[PDB]
Design a protein around this ligand. Sequence first.
Ligand SMILES: [Mn+2]
Ligand SMILES: [Mn+2]
Ligand SMILES: [Mn+2]
Ligand SMILES: [Mn+2]
Ligand SMILES: [Mn+2]
Ligand SMILES: [Mn+2]
Ligand SMILES: [Mn+2]
Ligand SMILES: [Mn+2]
Ligand SMILES: [Mn+2]
Ligand code: NA
Length: 326
Amino acid sequence: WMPAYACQRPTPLTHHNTGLSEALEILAEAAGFEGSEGRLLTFCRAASVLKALPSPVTTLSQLQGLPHFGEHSSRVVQELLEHGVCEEVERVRRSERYQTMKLFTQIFGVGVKTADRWYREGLRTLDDLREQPQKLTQQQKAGLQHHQDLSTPVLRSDVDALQQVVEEAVGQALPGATVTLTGGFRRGKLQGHDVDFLITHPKEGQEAGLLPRVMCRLQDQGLILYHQFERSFCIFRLPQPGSWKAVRVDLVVAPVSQFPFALLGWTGSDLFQRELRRFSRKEKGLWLNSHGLFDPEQKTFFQAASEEDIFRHLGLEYLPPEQRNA
DNA sequence: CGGCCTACG
DNA sequence: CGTAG
DNA sequence: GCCG
Ligand SMILES: [Mn+2]
Ligand SMILES: [Mn+2]
Ligand SMILES: [Mn+2]
Ligand SMILES: [Mn+2]
Ligand SMILES: [Mn+2]
Ligand SMILES: [Mn+2]
Ligand SMILES: [Mn+2]
Ligand SMILES: [Mn+2]
Ligand SMILES: [Mn+2]
Ligand code: NA
């Protein structure tokens, strides 16, 4: 009917229940801030079910039988339908705790546990953090230094410019190596928090050692403001007319044997991939990550040449990236 | 009861 | 701990 | 919070 796992149904980028899903996602985020990943996941799964529906929900009746809707999520929807507002959601969004945890966790290098410690210490603003720089890692220092730019949506023109300089550096580092745009932009998003790239080479093994060489070539062109291997979480100095802006870029290398798995994982959405890995293990007895798909009884890895091969093997109807917006 | 994705830096 | 989708 |  409505399948229970998000990887079993198409979720388009544009859907029909934004008001309801956004309210449930507030509660999910707040559950995360209080350290309950289980409640976070339920609220995100409920919100995702609404994104997959073909029409607006207008009456409580339409939730009957939907997976991940129980008493709490149904009451939130009921109050939004009846009153236009959910008291619990409004109390969360106006709370000092929620607003400060959101502010701090949005910083690159800061998660819930760090944000919660700072909150318990009385810190409330970005200026509070900057005044106490000894309590910051180098990663957090970079996230705070570039926070304004990193809060500006990344546009497609930015993606295209970044893809060009990444392709130039990759080609200088290793002839024949390829760059694939992944992440939300591959799912059709028009804006993003960052740009994700996946790099490989058609000859297994030639990509060994590639990422440090790419990073050196980008840094020699003055393109790198921060970096810290096979995954590089960077901040680039992106030229703009007369100036520049900082942009988060993730660069990932995989051998071609792993490419379909890495492409699938890095294309998301986050919830889609968590649900796909859960489905794989719990329903099919196979272990999925961005490196492979492992049968733990035969002790063998599935050889995939495409994302479609992975969906088949898991017994799932193929979904293109633009239907993975769970 | 107890799981909730599964990696790398 | 942080990062990722 | 929901569900296997
Ligand atoms: Mn539609
Ligand atoms: Mn409740
Ligand atoms: Mn009422
Ligand atoms: Mn991204
Ligand atoms: Mn690896
Ligand atoms: Mn990214
Ligand atoms: Mn329990
Ligand atoms: Mn993400
Ligand atoms: Mn509980
Ligand atoms: Na963060």
